[PDB]
Amino acid sequence: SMNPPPPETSNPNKPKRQTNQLQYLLRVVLKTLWKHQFAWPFQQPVDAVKLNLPDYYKIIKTPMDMGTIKKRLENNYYWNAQECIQDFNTMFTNCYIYNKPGDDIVLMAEALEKLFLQKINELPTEE
Numbered sequence: 001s002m003n004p005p006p007p008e009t010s011n012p013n014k015p016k017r018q019t020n021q022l023q024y025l026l027r028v029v030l031k032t033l034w035k036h037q038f039a040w041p042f043q044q045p046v047d048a049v050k051l052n053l054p055d056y057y058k059i060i061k062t063p064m065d066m067g068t069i070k071k072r073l074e075n076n077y078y079w080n081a082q083e084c085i086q087d088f089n090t091m092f093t094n095c096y097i098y099n100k101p102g103d104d105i106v107l108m109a110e111a112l113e114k115l116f117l118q119k120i121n122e123l124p125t126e127e
């Protein structure tokens, strides 16, 4: 009954960068999703322990969540936007894999993903 360590949000050996696309991701894409009524289950790592999902981390080996993404953005963890996009996709995909296609949690992930795809559609060209 332990959770894994969470995904890293800082790394002294990983080069860091600011891009206009990373700024958009924090200021428009994450901001839009974070304040959405369906954000809250996704605002922190899945706590398999407190939520009583004991097989969660047997099935999901690449956990991701918006809490993690927010810190990564804030900490300038990423070098490029594509890394951050891949984190959002990982988070959605994990939800779709672990849960049944009927579940409330899946319908929420889907609505957030739709809005995410709407916001990254207008991702500005880099400077």
Ligand SMILES: CN1Cc2cc(S(=O)(=O)Nc3ccccc3)ccc2NC1=O
Pocket: 041, 042, 046, 051, 053, 094, 095, 098, 099, 104, 105
């Ligand atoms: C991202 N999550 C997190 C998660 C949280 C929970 S919950 O027990 O809070 N129940 C709950 C909460 C909100 C909406 C619907 C159900 C259950 C399952 C999951 N599965 C996931 O995949």
